[PDB]
Amino acid sequence: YVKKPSYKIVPHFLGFNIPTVSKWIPIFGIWGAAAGIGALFLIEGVPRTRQDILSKIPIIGEHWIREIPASDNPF
Amino acid sequence: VSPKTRTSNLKNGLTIASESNPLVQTATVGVWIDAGSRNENAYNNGTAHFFEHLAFKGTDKRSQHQLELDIENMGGHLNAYTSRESTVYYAKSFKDDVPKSVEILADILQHSKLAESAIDREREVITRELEEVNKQYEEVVFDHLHATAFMNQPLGRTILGPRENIQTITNTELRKFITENYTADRMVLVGAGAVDHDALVELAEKYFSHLPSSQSPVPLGTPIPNFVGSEVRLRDDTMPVAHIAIAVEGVSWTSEDYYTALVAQAIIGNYDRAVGTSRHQGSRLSNIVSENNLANSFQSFSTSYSDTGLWGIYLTSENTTQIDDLVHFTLKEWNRLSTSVSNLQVERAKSQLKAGLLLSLDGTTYVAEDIGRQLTTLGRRVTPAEVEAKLEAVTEHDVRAWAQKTLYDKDIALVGLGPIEGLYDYNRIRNDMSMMRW
Amino acid sequence: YMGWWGHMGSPPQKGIAGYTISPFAARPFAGVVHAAIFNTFRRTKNQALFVILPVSFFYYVWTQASEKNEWLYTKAGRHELAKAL
Amino acid sequence: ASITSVVKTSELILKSPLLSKIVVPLAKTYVKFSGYRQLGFKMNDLIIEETPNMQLALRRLPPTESYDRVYRLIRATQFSLSHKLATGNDITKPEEDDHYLIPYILDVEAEAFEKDALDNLEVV
Amino acid sequence: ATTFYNVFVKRNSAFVATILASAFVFDMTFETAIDNFWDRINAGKQWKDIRHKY
Amino acid sequence: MALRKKNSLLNMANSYVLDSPQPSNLNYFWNFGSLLALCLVIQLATGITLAMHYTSHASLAFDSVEHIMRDVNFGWFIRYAHANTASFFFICIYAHMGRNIYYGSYKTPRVLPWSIGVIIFLLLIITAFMGYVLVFGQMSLWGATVICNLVSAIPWLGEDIVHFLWGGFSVGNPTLQRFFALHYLMPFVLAVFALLHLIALHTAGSSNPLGITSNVDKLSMHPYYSFKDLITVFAFLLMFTLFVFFSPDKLGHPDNYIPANPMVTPASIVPEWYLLPFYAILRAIPDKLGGVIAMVAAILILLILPIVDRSIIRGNAFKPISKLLFGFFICNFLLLGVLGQVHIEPPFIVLGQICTIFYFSYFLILLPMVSTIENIFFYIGSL
Amino acid sequence: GKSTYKIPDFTPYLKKDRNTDANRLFSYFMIGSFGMLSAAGAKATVQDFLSNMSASADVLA
Numbered sequence A: 001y002v003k004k005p006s007y008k009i010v011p012h013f014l015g016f017n018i019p020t021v022s023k024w025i026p027i028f029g030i031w032g033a034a035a036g037i038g039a040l041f042l043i044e045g046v047p048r049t050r051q052d053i054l055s056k057i058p059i060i061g062e063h064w065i066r067e068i069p070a071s072d073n074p075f
Numbered sequence B: 001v002s003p004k005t006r007t008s009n010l011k012n013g014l015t016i017a018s019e020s021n022p023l024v025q026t027a028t029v030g031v032w033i034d035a036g037s038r039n040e041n042a043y044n045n046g047t048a049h050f051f052e053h054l055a056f057k058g059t060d061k062r063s064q065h066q067l068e069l070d071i072e073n074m075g076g077h078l079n080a081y082t083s084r085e086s087t088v089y090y091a092k093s094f095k096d097d098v099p100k101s102v103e104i105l106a107d108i109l110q111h112s113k114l115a116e117s118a119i120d121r122e123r124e125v126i127t128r129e130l131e132e133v134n135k136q137y138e139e140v141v142f143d144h145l146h147a148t149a150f151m152n153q154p155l156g157r158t159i160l161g162p163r164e165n166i167q168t169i170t171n172t173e174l175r176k177f178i179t180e181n182y183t184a185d186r187m188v189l190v191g192a193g194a195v196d197h198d199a200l201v202e203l204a205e206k207y208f209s210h211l212p213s214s215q216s217p218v219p220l221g222t223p224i225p226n227f228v229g230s231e232v233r234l235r236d237d238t239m240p241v242a243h244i245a246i247a248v249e250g251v252s253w254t255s256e257d258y259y260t261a262l263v264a265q266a267i268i269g270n271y272d273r274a275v276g277t278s279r280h281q282g283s284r285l286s287n288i289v290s291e292n293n294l295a296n297s298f299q300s301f302s303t304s305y306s307d308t309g310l311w312g313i314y315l316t317s318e319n320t321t322q323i324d325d326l327v328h329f330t331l332k333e334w335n336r337l338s339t340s341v342s343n344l345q346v347e348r349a350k351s352q353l354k355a356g357l358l359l360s361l362d363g364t365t366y367v368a369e370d371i372g373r374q375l376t377t378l379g380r381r382v383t384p385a386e387v388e389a390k391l392e393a394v395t396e397h398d399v400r401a402w403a404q405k406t407l408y409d410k411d412i413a414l415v416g417l418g419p420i421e422g423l424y425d426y427n428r429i430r431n432d433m434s435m436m437r438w
Numbered sequence C: 001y002m003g004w005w006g007h008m009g010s011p012p013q014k015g016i017a018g019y020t021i022s023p024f025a026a027r028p029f030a031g032v033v034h035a036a037i038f039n040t041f042r043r044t045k046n047q048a049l050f051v052i053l054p055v056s057f058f059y060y061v062w063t064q065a066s067e068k069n070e071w072l073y074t075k076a077g078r079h080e081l082a083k084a085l
Numbered sequence D: 001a002s003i004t005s006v007v008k009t010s011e012l013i014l015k016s017p018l019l020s021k022i023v024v025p026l027a028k029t030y031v032k033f034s035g036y037r038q039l040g041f042k043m044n045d046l047i048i049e050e051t052p053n054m055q056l057a058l059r060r061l062p063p064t065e066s067y068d069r070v071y072r073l074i075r076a077t078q079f080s081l082s083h084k085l086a087t088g089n090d091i092t093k094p095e096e097d098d099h100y101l102i103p104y105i106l107d108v109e110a111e112a113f114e115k116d117a118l119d120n121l122e123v124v
Numbered sequence E: 001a002t003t004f005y006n007v008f009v010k011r012n013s014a015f016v017a018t019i020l021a022s023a024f025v026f027d028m029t030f031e032t033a034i035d036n037f038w039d040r041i042n043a044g045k046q047w048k049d050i051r052h053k054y
Numbered sequence F: 001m002a003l004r005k006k007n008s009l010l011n012m013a014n015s016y017v018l019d020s021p022q023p024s025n026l027n028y029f030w031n032f033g034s035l036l037a038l039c040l041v042i043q044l045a046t047g048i049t050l051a052m053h054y055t056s057h058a059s060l061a062f063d064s065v066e067h068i069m070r071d072v073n074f075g076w077f078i079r080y081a082h083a084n085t086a087s088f089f090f091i092c093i094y095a096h097m098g099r100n101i102y103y104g105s106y107k108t109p110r111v112l113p114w115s116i117g118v119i120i121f122l123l124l125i126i127t128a129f130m131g132y133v134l135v136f137g138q139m140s141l142w143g144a145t146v147i148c149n150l151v152s153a154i155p156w157l158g159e160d161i162v163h164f165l166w167g168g169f170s171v172g173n174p175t176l177q178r179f180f181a182l183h184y185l186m187p188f189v190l191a192v193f194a195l196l197h198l199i200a201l202h203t204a205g206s207s208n209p210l211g212i213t214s215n216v217d218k219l220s221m222h223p224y225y226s227f228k229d230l231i232t233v234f235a236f237l238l239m240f241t242l243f244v245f246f247s248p249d250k251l252g253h254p255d256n257y258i259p260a261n262p263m264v265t266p267a268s269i270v271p272e273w274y275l276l277p278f279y280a281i282l283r284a285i286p287d288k289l290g291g292v293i294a295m296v297a298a299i300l301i302l303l304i305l306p307i308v309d310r311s312i313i314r315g316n317a318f319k320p321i322s323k324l325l326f327g328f329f330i331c332n333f334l335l336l337g338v339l340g341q342v343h344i345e346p347p348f349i350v351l352g353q354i355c356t357i358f359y360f361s362y363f364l365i366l367l368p369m370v371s372t373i374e375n376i377f378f379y380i381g382s383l
Numbered sequence G: 001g002k003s004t005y006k007i008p009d010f011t012p013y014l015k016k017d018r019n020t021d022a023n024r025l026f027s028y029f030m031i032g033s034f035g036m037l038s039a040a041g042a043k044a045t046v047q048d049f050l051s052n053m054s055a056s057a058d059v060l061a
């Protein structure tokens, strides 16, 4: 015989609880990657991005190490 | 702890299944048949329902009138229904009136006259039933829902059949149908209430012994359905209430996901503004709908067949300018079965179901319907202990997995009837089957 | 939260009679002298502290700071300036 | 803030003898300086009502109380625009400053906060 | 094939991430491919082809 | 049905300027909205006029402004009107924001008009800053130099961003031409956001000085507020007239009548008066990046008022402690202004830091504390 | 022409493999290709177009 239902209230805030948010943690991961890829993509042209990020990538990184021959460069 | 469901076979292969209850004074015996509209082709569609009418139109011994009197003298009543996959003929009686009722049912199933004169008489009665179902809106909506979901397939046909067939059904094709389909190996004689199993088995040996056996006896509940995402709109601006069903392809009786789909159905749940308690229900859709007066009612369903099913919701609403919100919120609640459900909702819905599947059985008719349904769909009665174990095995992870394969971004079948101007086109409804934020 | 004329969203009103007279029937400047003097005095007296306290405090602060700054950049303030840097 | 919060905290203060001894006289002075009574308002007339909860509490007021509230708001609005204060019977006397609305909003909020709690229950 | 759907398409966060990563790769490779093609159809015409004389 | 209600276009005007239901008790501080609309119109009219005479090339910009002053008929007026109305725009905008803070206009249900408002305030700052550069006097140049070198504090990319905005390695012709184009455009963006914050407000309607609902007692916007708005228009134009015609250079800085010289640095780079509080906040933080963040946070922190005000009552009319705290807050904001124009010397360095702490602690500590305590005092005090 | 449960003939347009993952995936490959080219095109457009704001050739000299 059961006298009372057996439950707890989980901590919550603004209608979010830890069980629910934990299900979405992966999704923020993917959106963060999407934002990372997207941001980096947008500034791929910026010379500093190439110098500091893109040229350092192994194998692929030589794609962004390009010199104008000094004979063809007005500046 | 319920009494044990006893099961015996005859020589022909008729199953007898009984659940005795020495606390009641009535009994429900009947015959559950693993056969229904789905067993017809397109030419004899409506035969099964036609037969239901003729079964009570007299036998080789008792005439129509004698039949009526014999049942009246028993004291109880007879009832029958034909569905897509199942036909039932049962007799509620007193304890000691069971031998009469088994004898009557055996008579109407094996030895029906089906006289041309009676076929011709019923042909008008059934024709008139085509124009009076029109009033039963839930049934109209579900009939269209099957028609479209299983377009040009056996499950998509109606039970009544087309007007054309009703005019051309002969006693020959009726005889042929019940000879091919109502075979011993497809039938279960069920007794619930004040029945002795051994007495029922003796009555079956006396009355159902000369039933035809099928050539190829497959096990009970043995079946190719190809769901079509599609919509039927039956706009009727003169109706005050809109009725809308949305469904996706659901699960068969013998799916591994059968219980998972029932838990998911319970997470959305039912709601009715006429019931006092409904505004307090835990279901998120219930809260949205009640706070915003979006609907009169909704009813989640999970209909199963031998090889497919429909899982969905049926909504009714007088709020004709916010049907879009009702459908929007409903479909976003389904999305959350894929994206958000946690131990919180799943454990709550399991608790509600652990009771609900046992609560349904509250009279002898309901017990008989349960024994009959389970024997003709699974081939056995599942004990409450096994049902409790299958429900306990359903985790949040299982529900999310199931929803992501069955609901998320899947095609829906959608039927709207009534003032549904505000129901958007197919694309916008189907676009709510996913969340861009996820 | 706000409607429009006819359904503004007021709780139902009942039992209030409102009366007013035409702008042409009124003296628009009736009792203006009394109001300009006695009413403005009342309203200002009631709010005076909430202006006087913060203004007097921040003015004192500024006065002290500006006077110190001035003094630090005199000959007399050479040493105190040297320490302050 | 929630009215529930205000009410609960106030009850903690009124319980503690020390705290009440120092706070209740302050609060009485505060309300005298606040000066809402000089526009013929009762305290509860000033609570922000453009919230779903408060709209619901206002709908639950007895018709009499509701009609009286509408008059007090209209009267105060007229004193506001005239830059006049209430005189005589229009001034709210301390004994007339009854918490007519607090019971209703506490019930509305009680249910809303129970609903939030129960939306987060975990079967054990 | 269900696997491919489940991984890259089912979650929109994954699908958008896949699209942007694809866009990055396409952008880089298409640049390189057009460069080579343009150099072949305009062979001996461009400065890079005559620069060696100087 | 009347045409003004029937016709879709007329109905939109009607809903905003004629039948709009307003509280009957708005006081004169509700008139700054329409003054800011008047400022925005004067700035568009004078601004577009100056654009017809101004040349955005750095070799000619300063000279074109002299041409406006000396050769164009009424050019002096159009120039001084444009320059002074920029000051009046900020007087009115600070007043309008002050009104909104004092009367709790930022509370539900008006968080959205308030939040859009905070963006309008940022656009106005940017607009006025770019306009200042167009003269290409010494303050124009040295302003653009120092302010765009704050962006250098953004880590890693900061330098690159600065050079990209300048269009070169220093403030020069490219910078001037692009600021002209943007300064022309930004006021139109500002007008659109001004219109959005009104559309957002239309759902709740105006707050009123008592902070109660006005649904009980409404007045048509016209004629009552139309005629009330004329009083402040004429009061404004009187103040405008005194500056524009009688003291046109009182609010400005003489350094901008010296042509830009990248070599010579002026005595004192102080911004226009209305930017001075934010400038003081920036000086208070020793770190370059810290300073910039603080300066931006000093504006964006207004967005959290809806959260940190915990009062059950809207506005300060009835809250004596909140009124005192608000008085101190406003005076501190003026003291920050004054500290923005003193030299970085003792004892103003420490004082500026204290005033900056006070500014932030109003939103983060005092307003949440004071509003909580007043809630309790209202309840206990009325039992 | 009368029964509304007799769904009109859609066999000219119905895909036999309509509920397969293969089927959905194909259409999202079209949508995703379109999103990919739009993303690549937008990046190209933005990068090229905003480069006007970088120092021009006369300035760089």
Ligand code: HEM
Pocket: F029, F030, F031, F032, F033, F034, F036, F037, F040, F093, F096, F097, F100, F105, F106, F110, F113, F114, F116, F117, F118, F120, F121, F190, F194, F197, F198, F201, F205, F206, F207, F208
């Ligand atoms: C071009 C600048 C602006 C214009 C032209 C403008 C105009 C107006 C107008 C006409 C109104 C309604 C009348 C009034 O209450 O005065 C109003 C209300 C309001 N404005 Fe502004 N505004 C501007 C900038 C701002 C800023 C910077 C803010 C906030 C930081 C702001 C916040 C609000 C708010 C919250 C209201 C509603 C106040 C209420 O009625 O209670 N506005 N504005």
Ligand code: HEM
Pocket: F040, F043, F044, F046, F047, F048, F050, F051, F054, F065, F079, F082, F083, F086, F089, F124, F127, F128, F129, F131, F132, F133, F134, F135, F183, F184, F187, F188, F190, F256
């Ligand atoms: C919110 C609206 C505006 C503000 C706050 C504003 C502010 C300013 C300021 C502060 C200056 C420096 C004034 C000086 O000391 O000479 C200025 C100059 C200028 N503004 Fe605006 N402006 C606004 C709108 C416009 C618009 C719409 C135009 C249209 C082109 C414009 C065109 C100019 C021109 C050409 C100058 C340079 C000539 C001069 O300094 O007088 N302005 N603006």
Ligand SMILES: CCCCCC[C@H]1C(=O)O[C@H](C)[C@H](NC(=O)c2cccc(NC=O)c2O)C(=O)O[C@@H](C)[C@@H]1OC(=O)CC(C)C
Pocket: F012, F013, F014, F016, F017, F022, F026, F030, F031, F033, F034, F036, F037, F040, F190, F191, F192, F194, F195, F196, F198, F206, F221, F225, F226, F228, F229
């Ligand atoms: C012609 C219709 C087009 C709608 C927009 C035009 C303007 C408009 O709505 O005017 C109104 C007169 C408005 N005043 C008020 O809300 C107001 C309300 C209550 C009390 C008072 N004052 C108290 O005594 C008011 O002053 C106002 O000045 O707001 C401008 C900013 C609007 O301009 C725009 O947003 C477009 C653009 C030029 C910025």
Ligand SMILES: CCCCCCCCCCCCO[C@@H]1O[C@H](CO)[C@@H](O[C@H]2O[C@H](CO)[C@@H](O)[C@H](O)[C@H]2O)[C@H](O)[C@H]1O
Pocket: A042, A043, A045, A046, A047, G046, G047, G048, G049, G050, G051, G054
């Ligand atoms: C929120 C968005 C993020 C910020 C946006 C970034 C704005 C501008 C960044 C890159 C602009 C300059 O970046 C530069 O782009 C130009 C063309 O666009 C490229 O230039 C390349 O292609 C062009 C034609 O396409 C040729 O004329 C050039 O000889 C070649 O090098 C450079 O390889 C790259 O370094």
